[PDB]
């Protein structure tokens, strides 16, 4: 009886505290700041645990949004997911993806297929003895289930991206990933990966946060999401599969029109599980800058396909999806008849 | 007599690992006397003080001299050794062994033109000339000398010119235009096919030139392209295509294996705007490493071959890239 | 009226941690209206694009404006905020809160001269002037204006001059000699006491000057020294000694605690020879971080106080250092 | 009936492969290459596990020595300890310390006190299941005992520096350190640190190597060694104690004459066990360059005391001597009456 309508606006930042274009989104009446349910950003910086520019972007974005909304900055505590991934090597352009969602009473006619819907969950507080073990895995599975129900989705095959923010003291990102796999029926509780989990951890935040992007037959969005799996460090097929299953029909190269159909890409490039690529030795696990190089490579791959530097390229943590497999999701336009 | 050039790509697991390199000769597969250039990527930083680079240079020369049964200082001016340090990401350290021989009979059914190799030497370059006209036409001289060594007269047949000059940015820019002048790309601005290095105190420069010739016996052919921006794969594809692979946009696994080596120089862009957006690649403290990380990602995603020659990362928006591809009898 | 300057050193656990800073005022210990400068070390890289630096600047200004109950843009020209990024090794991030007030009665039994603070502002500096004579005498002007704000006429009483100019190496060198000219160290070469910064687009420069005066009510005194090479502790010891600690070579734990803050600029040396030997400090890719790592080691080993102001690491063999020390009634 | 005579020559290297001044040591007849029992060097480079410049210095030095000796380079395999520590930040000048030792039949008269003696041991081969556990600890204790007996030393209080090179896969350097503590009676086998162990690990070398520097009443050396403990990251007292107990009589500052008495200093600056220094927070454990900064700081401390940039400053690995305590030894002149 209510149908979700999700939207995405990608706006550049020239520094972690640059909220000019972000603020102009609202001031022009283009976007209603009350409709915003998530901010997903790439900031310049190192991307390591002590990357303070990342926190500077987080704090800056929250303040700009709270002003646009006319509330104090601590309302947005549980009403909006703010996710800043630090480290923007090479072709990656820092930016913020503004995700909005309202619900409308009538489902428009002539929307082909399924459409994007967003769900949000919160974990019970996670304690440093949980971090890494069963107790964390279950508090995250609950929140994934809660975000699914918030998005009105029951079929896990319709879920294409699950971002989890947990606390830190690898472990957190490993236990959180499993929680998603359990909640999606990818792995039975009793007992190993999730194809669509993109995990983060940091700060002293204790309540975990789940942001879930799926599709629904009852969606009013003019967008659709799909995913793929990057099979090794040089593979573009995962990216291409995410774009294709999101609804672009192409063989191997996108036309300029098809490229512009792609609204955002969310790719996590964790380091590979071995140092052998296509039968040869690579340095990517020995490199002191492995974390920065992983994202430099991922960005090169995604941007070479979409021609859009404002892509969400995260990752660079050491491995433990499938062996040496990385998730990537793509959000693509879905237009009426 | 007709030139027969060949290329053998062999991996290195460290700068001093010459095992598979030594096995090239010991198995009788390659004649160490025919080797005219070694072009390698080493692990390390790639900065002016990258000692692992030099370790690979020294290690390779010693292995080759043993395979030849001579002292290491004869290979001084008979073989071009070029090691580019810094192998981030998908780049696998390796050495490309280039051999060249002159046979009396030109095999039948070799299509089109074929790979040919030329070498030149500059007269010693003087450290006030480094960066100035005196370096320019003194490398133009060596470029001309390398063309004549390869038996090539048409500059449109020259697809890669590697120059190694001495260090003290500018050397690489003064060397580049020396190439542009010798190729008639510029009348005494840039060169589409110059790939410049600088380092050491070696006051004598070295030129290595790769071209095609109608009278070539090589089972190889070279082509080049221009990388338009930092995210552009079309330069790479053009190099492969003009080297003789016929494809629209994606290579089959069979076509991928036809590509023997790629030589890409990824200098930093001239601005920090890419596809209308701001990028961090000129502010980054690791810009030199990231530039090569990106170039390697682009090349390897197209060829699936981690043992590619990805150099660059010096401050400057167009970059050269050459590809060497199989050319098989009818 | 006689100036009373004070200094409160408070730790920060991150660039935005203003807890202990805010508690300074909330406890009634310090009057936020009396604050005339904030000088901080932040965690981060210290390079031109160190955003954690700016995060600390923004965070501190906001905390101070709240403590004052005013909007953050009044403090624009009433308070000098100087954050130096990059805190390797033994350097503990912190902010030194400098206050200054004018009392009508000069306390009795204050020995010698005492600390006094002056502030100047340059008229906007124009980006072609950056590096050129137009910046020089336009900061010399502000240095002169800061001297008159502190009521000091004898340049031998000036021990630290911090200048923040805009960025685009040279700014820091053109600012330095503007100080040297205003102090009569140079007639329209170097300044023994200039500590220069450059960044942002702020076309208006800021000068913060620390000196002594016979009519000072401060319970503090400042002195300076010159670090002769990269391994020299004598500059630091001279600064402490001329600030009024009487010691031969080592400080007692009591004398150590007398030292309130040290301001040391560790620019890279002019050569790569130290005590007759070759060092790597100019070749190192992390030279800027290492320079400050070494300076912090030297200072902290002498004072035992990790919350010291260690700046520098720009390319150039003498470096300035000032020390502020307790001056207690008879 | 035989008395050891140990010597040390510190010669600069301007690059890892620069053996000019090293070679001139022998060619001038100043030093007999047959007498060399150890080479201890600092090389320019990163100091990380994949520092190839370090190996370049190792290979270069071995070749120069074998030529000076007129033998093939693989004789020196077990006759000379070659130890290159990579990473030379700040005031540290790359160099090699050439240690020689012969034995003479008559003990010179008028040598005050005890004097330097060198001992060398070899472990039984260490296997990657040993690395980190009891089996490694015991194969290293044996070699420490063997080097003690090679040096003619029975009293562990006379042992001031024990360098161990083990293989890698922290663990190795932790199990090797314990082996030294066991062999020196600092810790009973049944069961935690050694004040004088300086451990390394790398390569595929499997036989461990122990280089031990001690004193003996029966020593003919014109040198003496002593040690101290660096109590925290800003402490100079450990260095000063090593110099003082090696036989320089000073209160707090060395005269230029006393400085030149100090022949070499061997300081290992492992990262501290906490991030609190003198009651304040420091960044030295969060820093991405912690390994390089630790050695930059150690070098600053040592060189500020001796004025000699050619000092052996090693370390920068994460902690696990006493809590946040680092060893340092000093070798100092001991001259006849």
From Swiss-Prot, chains A, D:
Keywords from the UniProt entry: Disulfide bond, Hydrolase
Active-site positions on this chain: 165, 200 (nucleophile)
Record region (RU A): 1-106
Single GO term (MF): hydrolase activity, acting on carbon-nitrogen (but not peptide) bonds, in cyclic amides
Region RU B, annotated ranges: 115-217
Top-level enzyme category: hydrolase
Top-rank taxon: Bacteria
Enzyme Commission number, as recorded: 3.5.2.-
Pfam family of the protein (one): Amido_AtzD_TrzD
Region (RU C): 223-337
Binding site for substrate: 54, 85-86, 173, 200-201, 295, 314-315
InterPro entries: AtzD/Barbiturase, AtzD/Barbiturase_RUA, AtzD/Barbiturase_RUB, AtzD/Barbiturase_RUC
Family: Belongs to the cyclic amide hydrolase (CyAH) family.
Quaternary assembly: Homotetramer; disulfide-linked. The disulfide forms between 2 monomers in the tetramer, such that each tetramer contains 2 sets of vicinal disulfides.
Note from the entry: The structural metal found in both cyanuric acid hydrolase and barbiturase is absent in the Frankia CyAH.
Role description: Cyclic amide hydrolase of unknown substrate specificity. Catalyzes the hydrolytic ring-opening of a cyclic amide. Does not act on cyanuric acid nor barbituric acid.
Record's comment describing the protein's domains: The monomer structure is formed from three repeating units (RUs) that share the same structure as one another. The monomer and the active site possess nearly threefold rotational symmetry, to the extent that the active site possesses three potential Ser-Lys catalytic dyads, but one of the 3 active site surfaces varies in composition suggesting it is involved in conferring substrate specificity.
HAMAP family according to UniProt: Cyc_amidohydrol
Protein name: Cyclic amide hydrolase
Provenance organism: Pseudofrankia inefficax (strain DSM 45817 / CECT 9037 / DDB 130130 / EuI1c)
UniProtKB/Swiss-Prot annotation, chains B, C:
Annotated segments matching region RU A: 1-105
Name listed for the protein in its UniProt record: Cyclic amide hydrolase
E.C. code: 3.5.2.-
Quaternary structure and partners: Homotetramer; disulfide-linked. The disulfide forms between 2 monomers in the tetramer, such that each tetramer contains 2 sets of vicinal disulfides.
Family: Belongs to the cyclic amide hydrolase (CyAH) family.
Annotated region described as RU C, given as residue ranges: 220-330
Gene Ontology MF terms in the entry: hydrolase activity, acting on carbon-nitrogen (but not peptide) bonds, in cyclic amides
Highest taxon of source: Bacteria
Keywords: Disulfide bond, Hydrolase
EC top class named in words: hydrolase
Residue positions binding substrate: 53, 84-85, 172, 197-198, 292, 311-312
UniProt-listed HAMAP family: Cyc_amidohydrol (MF_01989)
Region of interest called RU B, as start-end residue ranges on this chain: 114-214
Active site per database record: 164, 197 (nucleophile)
InterPro entries: AtzD/Barbiturase (IPR014086), AtzD/Barbiturase_RUA (IPR043008), AtzD/Barbiturase_RUB (IPR043006), AtzD/Barbiturase_RUC (IPR043007)
Purpose: Cyclic amide hydrolase of unknown substrate specificity. Catalyzes the hydrolytic ring-opening of a cyclic amide. Does not act on cyanuric acid nor barbituric acid.
Note from the entry: The structural metal found in both cyanuric acid hydrolase and barbiturase is absent in the Frankia CyAH.
Domain commentary: The monomer structure is formed from three repeating units (RUs) that share the same structure as one another. The monomer and the active site possess nearly threefold rotational symmetry, to the extent that the active site possesses three potential Ser-Lys catalytic dyads, but one of the 3 active site surfaces varies in composition suggesting it is involved in conferring substrate specificity.
């Amino acid at each position: 009886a209510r149908y979700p309508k999700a939207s995405m606006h990608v706006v550049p930042m020239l520094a972690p505290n640059d909220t000019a274009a972000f603020r102009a989104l609202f001031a022009s009446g283009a976007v209603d700041p009350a409709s915003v349910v998530a901010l997903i950003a790439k900031s310049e910086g190192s991307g390591l645990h002590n990357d303070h520019a990342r926190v500077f972007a987080d704090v800056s974005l929250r303040t700009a949004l709270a002003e646009a909304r006319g509330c104090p900055v601590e309302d947005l505590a549980d009403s909006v997911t703010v996710a800043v991934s630090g480290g923007s090597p090479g072709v990656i352009s820092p930016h913020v993806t503004v995700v909005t969602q309202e619900w409308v009473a009538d489902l428009p006619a002539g929307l082909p297929g399924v459409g994007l819907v967003v769900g949000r969950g919160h974990t019970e507080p996670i304690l440093p003895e949980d971090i890494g073990r069963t107790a964390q895995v279950d508090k995250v599975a609950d929140a994934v289930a809660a975000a699914m129900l918030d998005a009105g989705v029951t079929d896990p095959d319709d879920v294409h991206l699950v971002m989890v923010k947990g606390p830190a003291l690898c472990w957190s990102n490993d236990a959180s990933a499993l929680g998603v796999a359990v909640a999606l029926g990818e792995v039975k509780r009793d007992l190993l990966f999730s194809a669509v989990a993109a995990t983060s951890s940091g700060g002293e935040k204790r309540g975990g946060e789940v942001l879930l992007l799926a599709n629904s037959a009852q969606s009013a969005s003019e967008l659709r999401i799909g995913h793929g799996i990057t099979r090794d460090m040089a593979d573009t097929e995962g990216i291409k599969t995410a774009i294709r299953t999101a609804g672009v029909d192409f063989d191997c190269c996108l036309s300029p029109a098809q490229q512009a159909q792609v609204v955002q890409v969310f790719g996590k490039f964790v380091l590979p599980g071995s140092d052998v690529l296509r039968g040869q030795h690579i340095t990517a696990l020995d490199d002191h800058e492995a974390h920065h190089v992983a994202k430099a490579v991922g960005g090169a791959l995604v941007v070479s396909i979409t021609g859009q530097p404002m892509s969400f390229i995260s990752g660079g943590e050491r491995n433990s999806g499938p062996p040496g497999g990385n998730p990537v999701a793509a959000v693509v336009r879905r237009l009426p008849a």
